Symmetry: C2
Subunit: 271 residues, 2 copies
């Protein structure tokens, strides 16, 4: 009911940006503009999320072309931009996926870069579960559970929410939330989006945040939208529509606890 899995009540902001235009600079600039609005509307924000592949076009034949960013010690155009937004504001910023290129293996991935309040690139998550959709990108192999001064939280990408292992894993390690930068479409969205979000939250009794891009009917891909935050019991506490917008929530440690007391997580591990 106060600091265990979540140290304090932290307010968050999901940014359902309509970026992904051919102009990367304009995309980052817009992601900057909208995070300024998030911080102005809710100054006590501590965690901010951007949607999947926000800095470039959401298309397999462009990934290579825009993977331009690589992540290491020495920054990158996108790694630097988000890094500077990270510490300019208190916030822990989940960069929400960008095309990645590995200098060595020459493979290109879809990774979510996570920063801390000082701007340091904490961890990163290469999309594990992912025809071209697999003929252009390579898969990740690590489960991502970032450590933070408030507690730990898992991060998965799009297709990754369809596999409960990723959640159970980060959740049982102590995570107070599983965050997923994803982009379902007008067909797959109405069918499984709400379900999975609420399913991963009640099964692991953690918070779940889904950050989708704004539905752009002018592109090849029509994002579903509906970025949401659901609480430990299945309740949707925040939710966007299809358009471009910012939603806000507050993760309470008493809510998680209150409902963990109710429905115990003591499983008969003999199976």
């Amino acid at each position: 009911s106060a600091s265990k899995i979540l140290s304090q009540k932290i307010k968050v902001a999901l940014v359902q940006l309509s970026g992904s235009s051919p102009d990367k600079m304009a995309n980052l600039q817009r992601a900057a503009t909208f995070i300024e609005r998030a911080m102005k509307e809710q100054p006590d924000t501590k965690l901010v999320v951007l949607p999947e592949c926000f800095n470039s076009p959401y298309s397999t034949d462009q990934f290579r072309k825009y993977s331009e960013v690589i992540n290491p010690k020495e920054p990158s155009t996108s790694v630097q931009f988000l890094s500077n937004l990270a510490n300019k504001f208190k916030i822990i910023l989940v960069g929400g996926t960008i095309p990645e290129l590995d200098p060595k293996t020459d493979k290109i991935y879809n990774t979510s870069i996570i920063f801390n309040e000082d701007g340091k690139l904490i961890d990163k998550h290469r999309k594990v579960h992912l025809f071209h959709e697999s003929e252009t990108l390579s898969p990740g192999e690590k489960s991502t559970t970032i450590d933070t001064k408030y507690g730990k939280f898992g991060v998965g990408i799009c297709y990754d929410m369809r596999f409960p292992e990723l959640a159970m894993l980060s959740a049982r390690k102590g995570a107070f939330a599983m965050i997923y930068p994803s982009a379902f479409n007008t067909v797959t969205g109405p069918l499984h989006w709400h379900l999975l979000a609420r399913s991963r939250a009640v099964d692991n009794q953690v918070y779940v945040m889904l950050c989708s891009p704004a539905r752009n009917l002018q592109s090849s891909y029509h994002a579903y939208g509906h970025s949401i935050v659901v609480d430990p019991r299945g309740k949707i506490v925040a939710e966007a529509g299809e358009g471009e917008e910012i939603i806000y929530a507050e993760l309470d440690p008493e809510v998680i606890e209150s409902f963990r007391q109710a429905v115990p997580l003591t499983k008969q591990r003999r199976f």
Copy 2:
């Protein structure tokens, strides 16, 4: 699209009975009456389910008293009754839980007894996951996946649907459906019932049937009702209200297949 996990299209019937009265005989008799109606309305039925603890009162202080039944080679009053209904009709009958008493250990469980088309007691499931609620009954340790001439299906009881392991287990073993005799209440039911049913079906892409008792406002326990059958993609194909009734569905092997093609189960087990 024809015999793999499910040999043929099999029609089923969930019996949302309002039994559980102090008179056991009357309860069985009623379960008999309603299964006759099931077979009359839908003669090609192959699988029939009864709701949790249908032959006796749903109260911890009565289980001992009504556990009167023990399951072995030599039948019991309830094991005999359901056995006879099993072969009188083609049907494979999931006796949907009754208080059980182990002669040796002298422990009493909440077990679901399964019969085949000739009346043989194929298998049984002692509720695994389950203050008095755990101070009157003992837990089970086996995961139940019954074998059938059409394919395999898993069986869990009430609280058991809250632990995805049980579903993943039976599902990956080859099951085409996870059946759960359960009895949520007017409080817990509106919150998690539909979600869990649909969550276990889309995550494992199998059929999920939940058989609840009829909501009896005259008892200490107010069952939620809403027995349902959801398909591999999350669609609810059959669903009862709160009252006493029988619902029907048809498990199609092409549905399971068609949607397994769409969303592959091929997971990166490297986690």
